[PDB]
């Protein structure tokens, strides 16, 4: 077995493990949630996870669209930015290449104070 074939199979296996993690996380966060329509820090959260469940990636253009739809409420825009920072913390740095472009950018940013 050459290194190229093993690398391809390793990438496929990483994709399968990431999909299983996304499914379990979606079930956990739905269980937490179920017990105007301005969404909050977890109601934002599952939507991104739902995009990860339907196999479409997180993108800077999606973040710009999500900022433009939530634009009148500044607290809610802060909530969605914090929620994507939560997802940046949850996903290991190797698999941020698989998730898309938002989370490698948001891994660099960090909170100034607790």
């Amino acid at each position: 077995v050459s290194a190229n074939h093993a690398s391809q199979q390793l990438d496929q296996l990483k994709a399968v493990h990431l999909a299983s993690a996304v499914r379990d996380l979606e079930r956990a966060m739905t269980t937490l949630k179920l017990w105007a329509l301005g969404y909050s820090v977890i109601m934002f959260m599952i939507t991104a996870v739902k995009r990860l469940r339907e196999s479409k990636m997180l993108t800077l253009s999606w973040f710009n669209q999500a900022l433009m739809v939530i634009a009148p409420s500044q607290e809610e825009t802060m909530n969605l930015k914090t929620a994507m920072w939560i997802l940046a913390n949850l996903i290991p740095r190797d698999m941020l290449s698989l998730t898309g472009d938002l989370l490698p950018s948001l891994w660099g940013s960090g909170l100034l104070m607790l």
């Binding site: 329509l37 969404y39 939507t47 739902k50 995009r51 339907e54 479409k56 999606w62 739809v69 939530i70």
Partner: peptide
């Protein structure tokens, strides 16, 4: 509407 724009 808000969910179909906030989802994908």
């Amino acid at each position: 509407i808000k969910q179909i724009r906030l989802r994908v």
